[PDB]
């Protein structure tokens, strides 16, 4: 249990989860600044009624929101390339301890693979995976037509984190490979704007189409 107790005592000096305090980590694009909660907290879990708050979700920590997306991602109407994604075997649903442990291994992997503060790379991935324009249907005289529309920043965060989680499910499903390694790949590929990542590719798809529907 010595790794367990080491990670227990290291954040005694208020460090997010175990290590990697939030002070060294910055924000690049000016739009995500008032919506990413980078405040120093030992655990990313408040059990808060931020849903009741029309915009109180901005106060929840980014890793907490990432787990909030990761734990509800299985079984839905989306069939990307004709696959059914679902957690048949010990679903993460209601098992936020499982999600905690898995994304804990995810932080460890990003440490041992990039050697930098994981929160900084997460900032990079979210900043580079946010689509910036979309399509909307407007009808006038019965004349439906498509329109290019700008996106709100908070929705850009929501969609970026959802791409991260949906990518983790997508690669981890139906493979010998395991969930944490996949989440690490999605994050690292988005953080360097790797188009092979589903997050950046679908950011590009959403930005396009809307690009042409003007």
Partner 1 sequence: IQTTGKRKTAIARAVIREGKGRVRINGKPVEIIEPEIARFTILEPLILAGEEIWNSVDIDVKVEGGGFMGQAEAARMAIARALVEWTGDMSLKEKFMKYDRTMLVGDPRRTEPHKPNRSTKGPRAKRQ
Partner 2 sequence: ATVYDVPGDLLVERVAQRLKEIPEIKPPEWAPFVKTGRHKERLPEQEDWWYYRVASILRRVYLDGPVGIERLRTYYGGRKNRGHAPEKFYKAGGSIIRKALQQLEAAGFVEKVPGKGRVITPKGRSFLDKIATELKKELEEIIPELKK
Partner RNA sequence: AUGCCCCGAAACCCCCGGGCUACACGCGCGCUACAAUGGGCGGGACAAUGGGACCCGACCUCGAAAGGGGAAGGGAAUCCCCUAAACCCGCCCUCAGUUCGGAUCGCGGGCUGCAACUCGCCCGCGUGAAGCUGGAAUCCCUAGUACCCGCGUGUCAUCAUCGCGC
Report what 12 binds from partner 1, RNA, partner 2, none; CB cut-off 5-8 Å by kind: partner 1
Residues 8-47 touching partner 2, rule: CB under 8 A, are: 9
Residues 172-191 touching RNA, rule: CB under 7 A, are: 172-176, 178-179
Q: Are 167 and 182 in contact (CB under 8 A)?
A: yes
In this chain, which stretch among 23-31, 83-91, 131-139, 204-212 interacts with RNA, using CB under 7 A?
A: 83-91
According to the binding rule CB under 8 A, does residue 78 interact with partner 1? Answer: no
Task: In angstroms, give the least distance from the CB of 107 to partner 2.
Answer: 24
Closest CA to 45 of 33, 63, 25: 63
Pairwise CA distance, residues 81 & 92, whole Å: 23
Report what 86 binds from RNA, partner 2, partner 1, none; CB cut-off 5-8 Å by kind: RNA
Pairwise CA distance, residues 149 & 138, whole Å: 11
According to the binding rule CB under 8 A, does residue 42 interact with partner 1? Answer: yes
Quick one: residue 133, left, alpha or beta (phi over 0 = left, psi -120 to 50 = alpha)?
A: beta
Strands (E) in the chain, as ranges, are 133-140, 143-150
Query: Which listed residue (3, 5, 39, 143) binds partner 2 by CB under 8 A?
Result: 5
Task: In angstroms, give the least distance from the CB of 118 to partner 1.
Answer: 17
Closest CA to 116 of 42, 166, 191: 191
**Lookup: tokens for 174:** 């139906």
According to the binding rule CB under 8 A, does residue 1 interact with partner 1? Answer: yes
Residues that bind partner 1 (CB under 8 A): 1, 4-5, 7-9, 11-12, 14, 17, 41-43, 45-47, 49, 97, 100
């Amino acid at each position: 249990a010595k790794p367990l107790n080491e990670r227990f005592f290291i954040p005694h000096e208020i460090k997010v989860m175990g290590r990697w305090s939030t002070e060294d980590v910055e924000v690049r694009d000016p739009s995500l600044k008032p919506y990413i909660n980078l405040e120093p907290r030992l655990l990313p879990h408040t059990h808060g009624r931020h849903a009741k708050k029309h915009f109180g979700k901005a106060n929840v920590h980014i890793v907490e929101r990432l787990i909030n997306k990761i734990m509800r991602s299985g079984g839905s109407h989306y069939k990307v390339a004709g696959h059914f994604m679902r957690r048949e075997h010990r679903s993460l649903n209601s098992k936020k301890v499982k999600a905690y442990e898995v994304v804990k291994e995810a932080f460890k992997i990003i440490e041992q693979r990039t050697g930098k503060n994981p929160i900084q790379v997460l900032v990079w991935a979210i900043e580079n995976a946010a689509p910036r324009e979309d399509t909307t249907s407007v009808m006038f005289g019965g004349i439906r037509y498509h329109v290019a529309v700008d996106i709100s920043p908070m929705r850009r965060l929501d969609v970026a984190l959802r791409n991260i989680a949906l990518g983790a499910s997508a690669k981890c499903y139906r493979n010998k490979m395991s969930f944490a390694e996949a989440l690490a790949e999605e994050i690292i590929l988005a953080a360097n704007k790797d188009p092979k990542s589903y997050a950046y590719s679908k950011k590009l798809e959403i930005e396009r189409i809307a690009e042409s529907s003007r």
